[model samples]
Target: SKRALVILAKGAEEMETVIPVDVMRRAGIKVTVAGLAGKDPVQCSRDVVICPDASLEDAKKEGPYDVVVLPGGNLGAQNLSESAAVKEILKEQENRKGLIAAICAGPTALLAHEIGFGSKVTTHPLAKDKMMNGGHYTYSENRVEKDGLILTSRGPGTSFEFALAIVEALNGKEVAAQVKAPLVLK
Candidate 1:
């Protein structure tokens, strides 16, 4: 089965993380929620608790997935960027020409890797300066921005658009359009 990895960490934005997983699974993609290792369930910024499907270590050993997605809150992004496991996965993705998607602060984690030297990218409005300094930045109001195989979006408001973009990228534009049709999404 084709698979996708959703990386979770403490204080993740509830919508940013869950919406993408929900939409992707709805699009028939196998989605896995891999939590950063620890005993406790990670808490979302909205105060929701999300227990991961597997620990980071387990996911790393099991994954070379089709796409790896990172959702952002503030501390959650910072935590993910600091994880050796995430960095390693990212490096591997780059090497294999695989897809990686991130939103809001999620892009911060990618920037932390310092490998997207000439990549076009975007991020949460607040992080505009940092994103610009990190790589080539494009200003877009569209929910998602696809630069190479790396997809990014602005914030919670763009959740559906972000998810649809991922579906389009991995599956095809037709499937993405079909998924959006019911909701009348443009």
Candidate 2:
């Protein structure tokens, strides 16, 4: 079975973290929430706590996943970016041509991994300079941008759209549309 690995760390944006899981599940995709090891309960930027379905260590041993989704907040991106395990996973994903969907400050994680050196990507407005420093960047207000297997978006306002874009990238536009239909989201 195909699966998507979602990397979660403390301080992730609540919507950016959850919306992709919800949208992908609605599209019948297998999504795994892999927690960066630390405390048992990870707190979001909004103060919501989430218990990860699996630990990063476990995931590293078990994964060769189809897609890797990174949700951004401020410190969460920092935590994930600083993680050695996460860096290894990102490196492997790049080699596989697997999908990588990052939103808002989430691109910070990619930048930290140096995965954006040649990839055209977007991120939260505040982090644009940092992203540019990582590699080539195109400033756009589009909800999402796809370059090869990498997908990125701006911020919270674009979170849902970013999630939908991941669905489209993995399952096609028709499936993405169906997943968005119930919410009347286009």
Candidate 3:
């Protein structure tokens, strides 16, 4: 079975975070929602609080997940961008050629961590400037863009697409379709 790690931070977009987690679970992937702060409830951008499955410090030892997911909110992305733990995790994942998926402002954290340079990516429209700060990666407007191991999407509206993209990458189209069919996503 595929394994996924979703890094949860304070001020993360609740919709972007929950949507992917739910969709991936439906795809039968083992998904861990790890809190960046500690094993506590994370207060999202909209004041929705979510208890994490584990602390990121502990989760890091679990090692080598199939995918690492970053859910976006401006402040949440900033927090991820500033974490050494996140840097190490993403670096290790990229070095091992595992999938790294980010949505909305989440991709900005990739820019900060210096991961996947030169890959084609898409971030939330408001995050474009920050993501392109140094012209390190190509930009796309597609709702979801997967260039090699780096998968990126625009915003909450595209979260299901983003999660499905990850499932398709790890579990193939059949499982992704199976998961999607029940969602009734027009």
Candidate 4:
């Protein structure tokens, strides 16, 4: 089964985190929700609390995951963007040509880490300025933009679609459809 690592940081978009984790697992992909700040309850953007499966430090020792996901919330993206650990994981995933999925402000972390340069990507409009600061990527307004191994989406409104896109990448369109049908995905 394909393996996925979701980096859960404080202030992350709960929908973005949970939807992808749920959809990927439904698609029969093995997913690990790794807490950036150890195995503690993380308070998300909307005050939702989520406990991770493991600490990011511990999850790093597991293996080269098939995909590394970053969910977006302004502060959460900032926290993720500032982490040396997150940078290391992103760099390794880039080098391996693995899928790196980020949504909304999440794509800003890609820019922060200097990863996925020159790919056509999308982020929340509020984050477009930050993501375009260094001229490293082409921006799009699409709900979800998949360029090469990097997948990005617009915002919380697009979370389910963003997740289904990841499912399509790791599993396949058929599996994505299978999982989406039951979840009533948009």
* TM accuracy, model 3: 0.99
- Which 10 residues in a row give candidate 4 its minimum summed lDDT? 177-186
* Per-residue lDDT over 66-160 for candidate 3, one digit per residue giving the tens place of the 0 to 100 score: 99999999999999999999999999999999999999999999999999999999999999999999999999999999999999999999999
Report every candidate's CA lDDT: 0.83, 0.85, 0.96, 0.94
Tens digit per residue, CA lDDT, model 1, 49-76: 9888888778888878989999988888
- In terms of lDDT, model 1 sits at 0.83
TM-score of each prediction: 0.92, 0.94, 0.99, 0.98
lDDT of 4 by residue, 17-114 (tens): 99889888888889999999999999999999998999999999997899999999999999999999999999999998899999999999999999
Screening candidate 3 with a backbone cut-off below 3 angstroms (N, C-alpha, C), the clashing residue pairs are: none
- Give the TM-score (vs. native) of candidate 4: 0.98
Put the candidates in lDDT order, highest first. Answer: 3, 4, 2, 1
Candidate with better TM-score, 1 vs 2: 2
Question: lDDT value for candidate 2?
Answer: 0.85
How far residue 68's Cα lies from its native spot in candidate 2, in Å, is 0.3
User: 53-134, model 2: which lDDT tens digit per residue?
Assistant: 8887887777788889999998899998899988989999999889888999898888888774666788888988877773
TM-score of 1: 0.92
**Best candidate according to lDDT:** 3
